[model samples]
Target: MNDSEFHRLADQLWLTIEERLDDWDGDSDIDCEINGGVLTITFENGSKIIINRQEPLHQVWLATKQGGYHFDLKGDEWICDRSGETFWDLLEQAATQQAGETVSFR
Candidate 1:
């Protein structure tokens, strides 16, 4: 994807995470920051979930303790082509597993 296209989607993902945390009810010890086109979320337990744009590959990549997930833009949504898993679900699972508490991203 083009730079503008990647940036636009990346910004949207950043906002989605930020806004969700702003209004989240579940307890979580997580902090996130977006810098240089990369978003990093760190948990209190030293666990991290990283999200960033893969410009040349035209996809968004997520790195967690479990593994790496590559998501492609699909009709305005980002999802793994092979697994068909959405970003929110993956993040929620990782956060929950790391934090020892439930985490919701919707």
Candidate 2:
């Protein structure tokens, strides 16, 4: 993917995530912010999960309390081959852990 392609895809990803969280009616509040190509998700407990675009590599990178994950577009979803985890599942897991409650991006 080129820079424009990465930007478009990453923008879609960030918007989808933000929309899901925004529509969710949960006990804990979740904050989602987009700065440039970075999406920062802040949990109620002050913990955060960051999703950012890697233009040079044509990948999306995720940062959680667990560690960093680099994702490549596989079909319609973003996946991390090294960890064998899809971006949605991993994001849900990390958000749930940090928020101290169950959360799902689905």
Candidate 3:
């Protein structure tokens, strides 16, 4: 996809994740915010995960305490370039670790 298309899809992804976080009623307090086109998920445990768009590369980047990952759209799901993991799967795992409880980003 072009930069415009990437931006559109990336924004949609961020919005969906934000809505998911907002709807979650977990024990830990979770906050999702978007600034300058970057999505930041903050947990009460003082940990954060960031998701941002890579316009030049047309990829979405995910950063967490565990590590960093880059994802590209494959069919309908975003798959990590290094681990081959889906974006939602990694987000859930990372959020669960950071929140000290099982969290779902779906």
Candidate 4:
């Protein structure tokens, strides 16, 4: 995807995160902003979700406290370095990770 396309997807991802965490109150200071062509989502505790579009690499890079993942758009699917879980499931995992909760795919 191009820079604009990455921004669009990042925006949608941020919105999905916000909607998923709507009931959160412990540390509910999450902000999503796009700077230049990079989209960053910052948490109240100073953690962040960073997404960068590498035009040269033709991939999207994702970073969180746990680790980093590289993804490419394949048709309508996001092919990540990890599992092919649905976006909502992955978003939930992200939130649970941020909350320091143990999560299982079962």
lDDT of each: 0.72, 0.78, 0.81, 0.58
TM-score of each: 0.80, 0.86, 0.89, 0.58
1-106: candidate 2 lDDT, tens digit per residue: 4777766776677777888987785667878887876788887778898877655657667888888688877887778766577878877888888887778787
Model 1's alpha-carbon lDDT is: 0.72
What value does the lDDT take at residue 91 in candidate 3? Answer: 77
Which of the two candidates, 2 or 3, achieves a greater TM-score against the reference? 3
Best by TM-score: 3
**Candidates 1 and 2 compared by lDDT, better number:** 2
lDDT of 4 by residue, 1-106 (tens): 4666666776775565444444354435655666765767666667666767665545567776767577666566565657644433464466557755522222
Looking at candidate 4, what is the lDDT of residue 21?
Answer: 48
Candidate 2: regions farther than 4 A off: none
Q: Across residues 13-92, which tens digit of lDDT does each residue of candidate 3 receive?
A: 87788889989878799878779878899988879998877665577788997787887777877888875888788878
Expressed as tens digits, the lDDT of each residue in 5-105 for candidate 1 is: 76776677778887776566455576776688777877777777777766554677888878867877666556765578776677778878877777888
Off by over 4 Å in 4: 1-27, 83-88, 99-106
Candidate 3 differs from the real structure by a C-alpha RMSD in angstroms, to one decimal, of: 1.5
Q: Largest lDDT belongs to which candidate?
A: 3
